């Protein structure tokens, strides 16, 4: 790590979020607000993605 | 924790030569490289070169070349710095100086004064 | 001594529901 | 190479008021890569600001740094009577980096 040299040598903070989907109940989610569920009707629905 | 203990004081002769250590402890001497700084008493700071303490590869400054040799001894956790044919206005308090949670400025050693 | 475990340590493979199924 | 000059060298001022310290480059320095130092008397060099804007562990903030390219700034809000220091700015960009000479500030 040079931070005299050229730019494509300089140190980066890499970060890499790895995903398990479908592997156990989905805990971990986005702020979206909740509503009421309405029942006998077809409607589109998103439970726990 | 990390504390780091220099040699004392030197009164020499000009034309003369000087080495200067500086002890580490507290932290891993090899996964810090070490850099030195001189400091004339009044004026300000000028960096005067760097060695690293895993390989040991070199890059010393233009106005200081052809003078200036550190050497590191990874076992007893140990940096050195040797100078020779020193002058007169070169009398300075020189410094020891590993970066450590920072680019620079980390652990500057507590000096040593080289009186020519 | 050994002996023979007979018919033991099924489990559930995959914590997927399913019901009247044969699945592999 | 690239020289620095902090033109107050020595700045009179009663403890509770405003000062300004100013510290320019030659050629132009990336903002990233610079760094500030506060030099108590008797003791080692102190990172007061490192990246031109982002203070270390410890630093009160009554200081805080700025600027980009050549042209750099260090403020002082509030003097208290234990600031009484002297300070050097020092930027390393490319190659040998360069110290500055300090700025004393006096009650």
């Known amino acids: 790590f040079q931070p005299t040299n050229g730019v494509g040598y300089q140190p980066y903070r890499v970060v890499v979020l790895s995903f398990e989907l479908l592997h156990a109940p989905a805990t971990v989610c986005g702020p979206k607000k909740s509503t009421n569920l309405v029942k006998n009707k077809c409607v589109n629905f998103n439970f726990n993605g | 924790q990390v504390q780091l203990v220099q040699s004392g004081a030197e009164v020499k002769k000009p034309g003369a030569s000087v080495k200067v250590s500086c002890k580490a402890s507290?932290?891993?001497?090899?996964?810090?490289?070490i850099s030195w700084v001189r400091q004339a008493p009044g004026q300000g700071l000028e960096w005067m070169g760097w060695?690293?303490?895993?390989?040991?590869?070199?890059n010393y400054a233009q106005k200081l070349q052809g003078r200036v040799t550190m050497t590191t001894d990874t076992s007893t956790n140990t940096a050195y710095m040797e100078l020779r044919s020193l002058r007169s206005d070169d009398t300075a308090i020189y410094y020891c100086?590993?970066?450590?949670?920072?680019?620079?400025?980390?652990?500057w050693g507590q000096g040593t004064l080289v009186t020519v | 001594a050994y002996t023979n475990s007979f018919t033991r340590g099924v489990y559930y493979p995959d914590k997927v529901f399913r019901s009247s199924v044969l699945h592999s | 190479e690239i020289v620095l000059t902090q033109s107050p060298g020595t700045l009179s001022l009663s403890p509770g008021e405003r000062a300004t310290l100013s510290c320019r480059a030659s050629?132009?320095?990336?903002?990233?890569?610079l760094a500030w130092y506060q030099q108590k008397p008797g003791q080692a060099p102190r990172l007061l600001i490192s990246?031109?804007?982002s203070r270390a562990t410890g630093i009160p903030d009554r200081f805080s740094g700025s600027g980009s390219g050549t042209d750099f700034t260090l403020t002082i809000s509030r003097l208290e009577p234990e600031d009484f220091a002297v300070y050097y700015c020092?930027?390393?960009?490319?190659?040998?980096?360069?110290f500055g000479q300090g700025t004393k500030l006096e009650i």
């Open positions: 100086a590993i970066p450590y949670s920072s680019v620079t400025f980390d652990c």
């Open positions: 507290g932290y891993t001497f090899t996964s810090y490289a």
């Open positions: 060695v690293s303490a895993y390989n040991g590869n070199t």
């Open positions: 050629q132009s320095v990336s903002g990233t890569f």
């Open positions: 990246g031109a804007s």
């Open positions: 020092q930027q390393y960009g490319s190659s040998r980096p360069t």
